[PDB]
Amino acid sequence: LTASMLASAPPQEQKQMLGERLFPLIQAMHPTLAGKITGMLLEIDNSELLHMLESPESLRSKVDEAVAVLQAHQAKEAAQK
Amino acid sequence: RQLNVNAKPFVPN
Ligand SMILES: [Zn+2]
């Protein structure tokens, strides 16, 4: 995936393009929550999403962050809701 | 660094 291929497509479809490259990696880390985490991350700068696709420590760091918030939220909706 | 927990899940293709 190149930045050129990305400008070639429109917004909505650029995330789809990026998600395809991101999914397999995020999946390896979390097979079950993969879909969701990916979805959550796709609302970030493509320029930075492009960076994460080249930096594992960065991708992982972002993934763990998403995992934490995701669980804290759900747990919240559990105690009260 | 702010994330949306209600973001629509992505699906492979
Ligand atoms: Zn919440």
GROMACS .gro file of C-alpha atoms and ligand atoms in nm:
model
   95
    1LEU     CA    1   0.000   0.000   0.000
    2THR     CA    2   0.136   0.342  -0.105
    3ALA     CA    3   0.022   0.696  -0.026
    4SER     CA    4  -0.045   0.733  -0.399
    5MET     CA    5  -0.296   0.450  -0.403
    6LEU     CA    6  -0.469   0.629  -0.116
    7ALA     CA    7  -0.512   0.970  -0.279
    8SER     CA    8  -0.648   0.786  -0.584
    9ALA     CA    9  -0.957   0.677  -0.388
   10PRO     CA   10  -1.220   0.880  -0.198
   11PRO     CA   11  -1.245   0.913   0.185
   12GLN     CA   12  -1.488   0.636   0.280
   13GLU     CA   13  -1.299   0.391   0.057
   14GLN     CA   14  -0.955   0.498   0.185
   15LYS     CA   15  -1.035   0.354   0.527
   16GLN     CA   16  -1.150   0.030   0.365
   17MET     CA   17  -0.817   0.016   0.180
   18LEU     CA   18  -0.625   0.081   0.502
   19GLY     CA   19  -0.833  -0.156   0.711
   20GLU     CA   20  -0.741  -0.444   0.481
   21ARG     CA   21  -0.372  -0.389   0.556
   22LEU     CA   22  -0.431  -0.331   0.927
   23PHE     CA   23  -0.671  -0.612   1.003
   24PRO     CA   24  -0.432  -0.911   0.969
   25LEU     CA   25  -0.185  -0.749   1.206
   26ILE     CA   26  -0.439  -0.643   1.470
   27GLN     CA   27  -0.601  -0.984   1.434
   28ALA     CA   28  -0.280  -1.167   1.521
   29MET     CA   29  -0.282  -0.977   1.850
   30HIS     CA   30  -0.656  -1.013   1.923
   31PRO     CA   31  -0.837  -1.274   1.707
   32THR     CA   32  -1.179  -1.201   1.852
   33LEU     CA   33  -1.177  -0.824   1.911
   34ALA     CA   34  -0.995  -0.763   1.581
   35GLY     CA   35  -1.293  -0.629   1.384
   36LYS     CA   36  -1.385  -0.372   1.649
   37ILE     CA   37  -1.032  -0.252   1.729
   38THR     CA   38  -0.963  -0.206   1.361
   39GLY     CA   39  -1.287  -0.008   1.328
   40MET     CA   40  -1.187   0.214   1.620
   41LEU     CA   41  -0.843   0.284   1.475
   42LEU     CA   42  -0.972   0.367   1.128
   43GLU     CA   43  -1.095   0.702   1.255
   44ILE     CA   44  -0.738   0.824   1.289
   45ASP     CA   45  -0.515   1.024   1.051
   46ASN     CA   46  -0.433   0.806   0.754
   47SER     CA   47  -0.085   0.960   0.766
   48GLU     CA   48  -0.050   0.817   1.117
   49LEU     CA   49  -0.237   0.499   1.022
   50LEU     CA   50   0.025   0.470   0.747
   51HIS     CA   51   0.288   0.517   1.013
   52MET     CA   52   0.151   0.241   1.230
   53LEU     CA   53   0.146   0.007   0.932
   54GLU     CA   54   0.521   0.059   0.926
   55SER     CA   55   0.578   0.067   1.300
   56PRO     CA   56   0.470  -0.243   1.498
   57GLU     CA   57   0.550  -0.093   1.839
   58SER     CA   58   0.326   0.199   1.735
   59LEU     CA   59   0.050  -0.028   1.610
   60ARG     CA   60   0.070  -0.243   1.921
   61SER     CA   61   0.076   0.060   2.146
   62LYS     CA   62  -0.239   0.193   1.980
   63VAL     CA   63  -0.404  -0.150   1.992
   64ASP     CA   64  -0.347  -0.194   2.366
   65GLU     CA   65  -0.489   0.154   2.417
   66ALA     CA   66  -0.803   0.065   2.223
   67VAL     CA   67  -0.830  -0.259   2.419
   68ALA     CA   68  -0.819  -0.080   2.751
   69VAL     CA   69  -1.085   0.182   2.671
   70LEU     CA   70  -1.303  -0.074   2.501
   71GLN     CA   71  -1.311  -0.287   2.817
   72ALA     CA   72  -1.345   0.001   3.061
   73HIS     CA   73  -1.641   0.125   2.864
   74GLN     CA   74  -1.818  -0.208   2.839
   75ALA     CA   75  -1.750  -0.277   3.206
   76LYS     CA   76  -1.907   0.062   3.278
   77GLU     CA   77  -2.224  -0.022   3.084
   78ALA     CA   78  -2.230  -0.341   3.292
   79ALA     CA   79  -2.220  -0.208   3.648
   80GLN     CA   80  -2.491   0.051   3.589
   81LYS     CA   81  -2.663  -0.040   3.260
   82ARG     CA   82  -0.492   1.009   2.135
   83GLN     CA   83  -0.872   0.977   2.167
   84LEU     CA   84  -1.071   0.670   2.060
   85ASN     CA   85  -1.437   0.605   1.988
   86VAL     CA   86  -1.566   0.284   2.146
   87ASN     CA   87  -1.876   0.307   1.927
   88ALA     CA   88  -1.686   0.297   1.599
   89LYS     CA   89  -1.834   0.052   1.347
   90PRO     CA   90  -1.636  -0.276   1.335
   91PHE     CA   91  -1.428  -0.330   1.020
   92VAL     CA   92  -1.477  -0.641   0.803
   93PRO     CA   93  -1.208  -0.800   0.580
   94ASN     CA   94  -1.236  -0.854   0.203
   95ZN      ZN   95  -1.815   0.476   2.753
   0.00000   0.00000   0.00000
